[PDB]
Design a binder for this molecule. Sequence first.
Ligand SMILES: CC(=O)N1CCc2c(c(-c3cccc4cc(-c5cnn(C)c5)ncc34)nn2C2CCOCC2)C1
Ligand SMILES: [Zn+2]
Ligand SMILES: [Zn+2]
Ligand SMILES: [Zn+2]
Length: 212
Amino acid sequence: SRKKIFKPEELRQALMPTLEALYRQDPESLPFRQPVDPQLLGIPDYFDIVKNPMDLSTIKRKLDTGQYQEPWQYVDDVWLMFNNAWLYNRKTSRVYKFCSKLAEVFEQEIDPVMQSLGYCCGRKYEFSPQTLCCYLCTIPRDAAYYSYQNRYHFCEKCFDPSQPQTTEKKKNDTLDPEPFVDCKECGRKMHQICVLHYDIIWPSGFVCDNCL
Ligand SMILES: CC(=O)N1CCc2c(c(-c3cccc4cc(-c5cnn(C)c5)ncc34)nn2C2CCOCC2)C1
Ligand SMILES: [Zn+2]
Ligand SMILES: [Zn+2]
Ligand SMILES: [Zn+2]
């Protein structure tokens, strides 16, 4: 019940250096300094594919007017901008490779900064894809396979006992967001894998090290 409230200036002063570190990159930040403009750039299908645009100058504006209540909302907007560019642009394009550079930079900046706002780290996604099971046989990362509605999986060399059975293609290269658990006292979202350990149990709810 002693919830942590971040004031705008606390967030701005801590996080703006991670944004400036992206803005610094030349030429890699140049497609990202201003909102995507589909008529000017002559890409009329952009908003058919990208439903929620995001860019460095919008993120800076939101930090400047205190529209972030807690720092993961900022991290989410950054990854939104990256994921928009990776989706819209082809793997071989300049814009895409620029995006992967900005991402590398951010992942190296964000952890100390999130730790100074009291968090475990600042990494949004899992390190590794989840080993999928082949319907004893399992599928490693990046391995190719066939799927149906996310449910049943088969390795390409193959392709509940009481449930009456009935009778596309992908690659296992996707990272899920790293799941969270809330501090019972301050309300901070921490990563389960960062703060929960095989030998500790939390009968009355997780409490982070700042609140202990
Ligand atoms: C971020 C995103 O998803 N966008 C969507 C696609 C896009 C963007 C930019 C773009 C916008 C503003 C500045 C840019 C600057 C450079 C640049 C500057 N120096 N260097 C070596 C490259 N490149 C692309 C830019 N173009 N396109 C393509 C337009 C069609 O034609 C091929 C490129 C934005
Ligand atoms: Zn963490
Ligand atoms: Zn198999
Ligand atoms: Zn706490």
